[PDB]
Design a protein around this ligand. Structure first.
Ligand code: P01
Length: 260
């Protein structure tokens, strides 16, 4: 049991409000040392081994970026506690689907999306691969900030859904699905379809239409993310810049509508 200087006393932590749960332990709001808000992820001794739930610290240590949720400190010898930065509006999905959700318009959702891509472009640069990129795995905070971090066939690229080839380009596919999430404010993609239809239909060439009031320059870039041949889908670096300049270069004559 030799460990890094990320290591803290497990009395400095102060598990306060229970955020949620799940199969792989639970997650809490709280306090580390005196002040500092913190998320506190834990492992249930029951599910997976010490080496398993201390892989996402092998990585979460090396990876520092503005839009990846930052590891603050761990406690390795079980019971386990991963302490990270607090994101205080919950997943992208909740946020976008709850009280504030209805007030967001396109400038705001496009900006969120530019941030997600900024993070998936740092992911990109490091030759990493996320493998489950969707709104539910994005977290939101003060100032509409959005950080990446942490069976979904509907968000997953064909080549991964069937042949298990996850690549950063198969991540781009989900990005485009995630663009439907931002643009309809929370809705499951492919509405009123079970998974076999989604696999069936994307295979015969179907693609989600343009959502209500969604400018057609947005949809094009969803279709760019949904190209059959994965080497063609654009990089997170292209995606990011496009979304950064959206309202000057692409739609500089955009007027706010009923919803977007
Ligand atoms: C327990 C889960 C349901 C939630 C969201 O998926 N997990 C969660 N919520 C977080 N925040 C949060 C804030 C308000 C309400 C709720 Cl439910 C969650 C959070 N902040 C930082 N992290 C991790 C990167 C450690 C977080 N993780």
């Amino acid at each position: 049991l030799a460990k890094d200087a990320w290591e803290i006393p497990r009395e400095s932590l102060r598990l306060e409000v229970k955020l949620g749960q799940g199969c792989f332990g639970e997650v809490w709001m709280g306090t580390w040392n005196g002040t500092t808000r913190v998320a506190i992820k834990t492992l249930k001794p029951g599910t997976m081994s010490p080496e398993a739930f201390l892989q996402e610290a092998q990585v979460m240590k090396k990876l520092r970026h503005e839009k990846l949720v930052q590891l603050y400190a761990v406690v390795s010898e079980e019971p386990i506690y991963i302490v990270t930065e607090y994101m205080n509006k919950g997943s992208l999905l909740d946020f976008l689907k709850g009280e504030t959700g209805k007030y967001l318009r396109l400038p705001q959702l496009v900006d969120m999306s530019a941030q997600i891509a900024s993070g998936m472009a740092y992911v990109e640069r490091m030759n990493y691969v996320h493998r489950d990129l969707r709104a539910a795995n994005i977290l939101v905070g003060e100032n509409l900030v959005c950080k990446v971090a942490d069976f979904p066939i509907k968000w997953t690229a064909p080549e991964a859904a069937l042949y298990g080839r996850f690549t950063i380009k198969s991540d781009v596919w989900s990005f485009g699905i995630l663009l439907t999430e931002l643009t309809t404010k929370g809705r499951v993609p492919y509405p009123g379809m079970v998974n076999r239809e989604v696999l069936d239909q994307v295979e015969r060439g179907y693609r989600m239409p343009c959502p209500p009031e969604c400018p057609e320059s947005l949809h094009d870039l969803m279709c760019q993310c949904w190209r059959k041949e994965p080497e063609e889908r654009p990089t997170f670096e292209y995606l990011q810049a496009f979304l950064e300049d959206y309202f000057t270069s692409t739609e500089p004559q955009y007027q706010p509508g009923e919803n977007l």
